[PDB]
Amino acid sequence: KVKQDMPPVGGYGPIDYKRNLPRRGLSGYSMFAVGIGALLFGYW
Amino acid sequence: NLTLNFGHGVLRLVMELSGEMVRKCDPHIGLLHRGTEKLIEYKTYLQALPYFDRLDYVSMMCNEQAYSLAV
Amino acid sequence: EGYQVPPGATYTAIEAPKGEFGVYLVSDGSSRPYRCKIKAPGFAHLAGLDKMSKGHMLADVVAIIGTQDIVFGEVDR
Amino acid sequence: MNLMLALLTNFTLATLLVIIAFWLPQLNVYSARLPFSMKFFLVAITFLLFDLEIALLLPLPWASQTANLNTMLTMALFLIILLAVSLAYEWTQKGLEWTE
Amino acid sequence: TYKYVNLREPSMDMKSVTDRAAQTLLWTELIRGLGMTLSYLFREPATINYPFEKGPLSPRFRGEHALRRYPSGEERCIACKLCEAVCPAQAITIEAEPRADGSRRTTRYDIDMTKCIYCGFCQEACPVDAIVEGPNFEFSTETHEELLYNKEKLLNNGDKWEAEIAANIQADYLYR
Amino acid sequence: MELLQVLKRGLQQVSGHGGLRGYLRVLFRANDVRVGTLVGEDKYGNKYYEDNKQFFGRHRWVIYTTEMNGKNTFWDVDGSMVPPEWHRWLHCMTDDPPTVKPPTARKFIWTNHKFNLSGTPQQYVPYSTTRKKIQEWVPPSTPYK
Amino acid sequence: MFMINILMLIIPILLAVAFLTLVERKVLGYMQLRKGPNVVGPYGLLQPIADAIKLFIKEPLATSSASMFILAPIMALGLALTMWIPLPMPYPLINMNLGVLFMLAMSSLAVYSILWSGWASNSKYALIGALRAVAQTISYEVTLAIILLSVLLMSGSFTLSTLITTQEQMWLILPAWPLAMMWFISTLAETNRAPFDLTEGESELAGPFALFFMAEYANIIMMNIFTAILFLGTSHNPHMPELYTINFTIKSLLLTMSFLWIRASYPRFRYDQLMHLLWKNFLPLTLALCMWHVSLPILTSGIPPQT
Amino acid sequence: GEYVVAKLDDLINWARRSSLWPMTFGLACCAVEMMHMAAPRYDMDRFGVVFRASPRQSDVMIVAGTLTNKMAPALRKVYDQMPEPRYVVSMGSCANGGGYYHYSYSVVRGCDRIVPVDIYVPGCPPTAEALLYGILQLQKKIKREKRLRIWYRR
């Protein structure tokens, strides 16, 4: 029987390609609140 | 205007600068000219194929494909 | 000897990674090409470096050469 | 004496390292104006003028110990604001641009 | 079909503007870049311990040339000169005459390894599997002349490497 | 704690190389103190190891012999010291070692592998292998003008 | 006794610089999915020694003025070692009442080695590269001096060991993290470190070389030691001073390692862009924060003691 | 006398071969396999071979690609500015002897017409591993040097 390189019956599984840059961190408000909070404690 | 004689392969750039700004860029190439096109005229069509690997030598098999399609 | 190619001329191009790469290949009927002009996309791109670099600074010339994707194997041939 | 000794040691050692760096066995028997750019001159001059204002601010940690804090705070802020005005003037007169 | 890489409108509400202000002043995206290089610091490196470890190759690898024998010890090459004709670099030079027993054999078989482009056309062209590119790639020299192989050098390569060459041909000849 | 199991894994490599001296010997000869499974040894003394839990490319390695063909190779090892039968395995050209799939024997195959001989009196020197093409006339050996 | 003390500072500084080159190469390597030096001695521990010997037996390859060609490296290395003598670790070699001013004064002299070597290069293009480097260095001197003054308005004096007392309860990075951020970046730009390594950048677009390299890498360590003292004050126990030295060394090592981390992470600034970062961003904020830190102790009644 | 000269030679040889800083002339495709030798798999830096050195700080010139006539003067100029001891590694068929372009009107038939060459690395291109073998061969050549022993016997 002919035997050559072929994909598996049913094909291969899905391959990702789309950009995936997950969102992380806090909002600008929260970040500024943490920074101002640190300064106030430091000043005190 | 200061003249800078020098500023993938090797390139010679001759530039005219006005402070930080580039006013002229004159690329001087041919530092990797190897007369490939003339050499191909002394080769059979198969013997010429490996010359195309060595053109855009980052995209070897695409250069091969272009030549193969043409032939 | 190699295979004989019927006489004629073709311009054949592909979308290579660096742009349009083509050959103008002239056959005289024999087993050796009569003329093979190689159209390298970086050739025209580098010819446009002077135009693209107008009004920019020295360090930007590096970025512009990089954005053009230049290999001198195909530019110089 | 200690600081003089330290300085003499540091630079004396630096001299010696340069010496041997230039002379080791080798084993062989055989005033114009420099393409003057005005922008770099103005950076140096601007640094100088700001450096002189910094000289005036350096006493501030000691000045805060005064009982005349009303006067001292007003003059400290006045000096820094005038420094900011200097920067603002240079900025709006294209003195911080590197084009052209 | 096409897509736009860079055609988006920033949201101009106060929350979004303040988000961009925080990124500008607190360097958030720059810190996010520091996280990537930090995560690579703690990954196993990809380096192999050459020459104790070697990069993987395949039976098709085109390395140093060799001239092969039949099992009896007779040379396979019969001086047909097909390899010399196909060589894109003209790296091969052959002379032949009748041997003392009448066999058609070469008296010269040179490969200029500094002209050769290691393309493998010679071993494709050969009708008797005489000239092959073997698996060896660690044969750099101190002088140019050592890379100008004559027939004795190439026969010695074949005798030196035949054990590996035969096994590699055994693995790939059904693709040829 | 995990850091504990890592530390004992480091200690096992010392005893896995036959004590401190063997451990330091491999550290300085090969800059690698991993312990693998001995796949085999060739007639020159090179030993071949495998560990299939390592990533592809590091799963096979050779500890070169300290002496080959009259050359001291304790420090001066060379990739060309691997004989051809082990060359196929070490480069992953095949899966099975010559101890399991020995090469076919031929009377003309070198019984003694040679490493790179460049820069030595054994180096190859090129020459023309063909005989003289034109025979010159030899004058007679008796006077007769 | 004092000469022994000087040598127990000079010698370790040079050895620390030597092995920072190894640490830099290996840290960069692992962030690049590779190893860096690991053949020349175990884990590359002999690599700095091989490099050092190699450079010093290399051919020492005409100067436009011999006196300045030799002065520039002596100045660089001599000044670099001098910046260490007032550092409290926890006790300074020399206890200066104005140690902070001394470091500011000595660091301002370091730009002469750049200027003199550009003059001695005998090349129009090397002199221009030196002048560009000088303009960068003096530009970032401005914010460094103003940031330092702002911090000292919480400390009360120019004595470096007083920064230890000021941070007995809390690191100064908490009340002054906006200044810490600009201070840290300013040190990178001040030492021509990436992404501010424009001398090595713009340039490519033996013993004397080694000497300049040692001076620069000594300055890198010193600047991060200064940063640790300025913003991450270690607590001093007079009966166990080695406890201070261990904790303070770890902070300085980590700060130095973050210089390497940053080199591995970002592209380079354009020259005009790093000038705008200073004159249009850092300097405005530094000036505003200088006014703020003048007012804050007064308005909170938190003025520190003069002594 | 003999013992000191021999040990000192071993020391300077070890330092020079353990800290080989290359100037790479990336002329053509062979330069790509040189980049792969610097890449993580082979990591030439781990041998003390820094990625890219300045020509005036360099100890070995790697000619990685075709040397054209137009380029030949520039390559010689860089070689002459190198501080000694300096070595040259010729990489690939083009630099070794012209290679595929040996018969071209515009190509130098081997960089050894322009500069002396210490090591010839064959291949078109040599694999990154082949080039690394060549660099290690150069290290062994440096280990064989006896400069001080010969100096002592003058």
Ligand SMILES: CCCCCCCCCCCCCCCCCC(=O)OC[C@H](COP(=O)(O)OCCN)OC(=O)CCCCCCCCCCCCCCCCC
């Ligand atoms: C209640 C009263 C309160 C009163 C006080 C209030 C003050 C606090 C609130 C304000 C916060 C101030 C923050 C100060 C930090 C400096 C901010 C800054 O200058 O960033 C702007 C600068 C340029 O930004 P750019 O996007 O290029 O363009 C803007 C102009 N066109 O962008 C940059 O500077 C980028 C820096 C480039 C360098 C990159 C390498 C560094 C990345 C790693 C940094 C790690 C953090 C350092 C930590 C140091 C620890 C010691």
Ligand SMILES: CCCCCCCCCCCCO[C@@H]1O[C@H](CO)[C@@H](O[C@H]2O[C@H](CO)[C@@H](O)[C@H](O)[C@H]2O)[C@H](O)[C@H]1O
């Ligand atoms: C371009 C020119 C710019 C010039 C800028 C000048 C800005 C000056 C702004 C603040 C000046 C005064 O700032 C502050 O005001 C309060 C007003 O109660 C003063 O008063 C406060 O301190 C004094 C002490 O002297 C106390 O007696 C008083 O009970 C207290 O309220 C402060 O002493 C002064 O420090």
Ligand SMILES: CCCCCCCCCCCCO[C@@H]1O[C@H](CO)[C@@H](O[C@H]2O[C@H](CO)[C@@H](O)[C@H](O)[C@H]2O)[C@H](O)[C@H]1O
């Ligand atoms: C940090 C302490 C290190 C202590 C090491 C002590 C070792 C002392 C012996 C050093 C021997 C140096 O060996 C020698 O160095 C010089 C450096 O220019 C080299 O170069 C020298 O010789 C070449 C010709 O050969 C000349 O063209 C060149 O001008 C000259 O500089 C030599 O090629 C090398 O043979």
Ligand SMILES: N=C(N)NC(=N)NCCc1ccc(I)c(Cl)c1
């Ligand atoms: N930039 C790096 N980290 N690597 C690097 N090649 N540094 C330079 C190497 C060097 C220079 C002087 C000395 I003294 C020493 Cl011991 C080493």
Ligand code: SF4
């Ligand atoms: S591999 Fe190609 S270039 Fe080399 S000898 Fe064979 S046919 Fe000629």
Ligand code: SF4
């Ligand atoms: S090696 Fe093969 S192709 Fe070449 S001459 Fe001999 S038999 Fe013919």
Ligand code: SF4
């Ligand atoms: S030897 Fe081969 S790979 Fe190298 S530059 Fe020449 S053609 Fe390209």
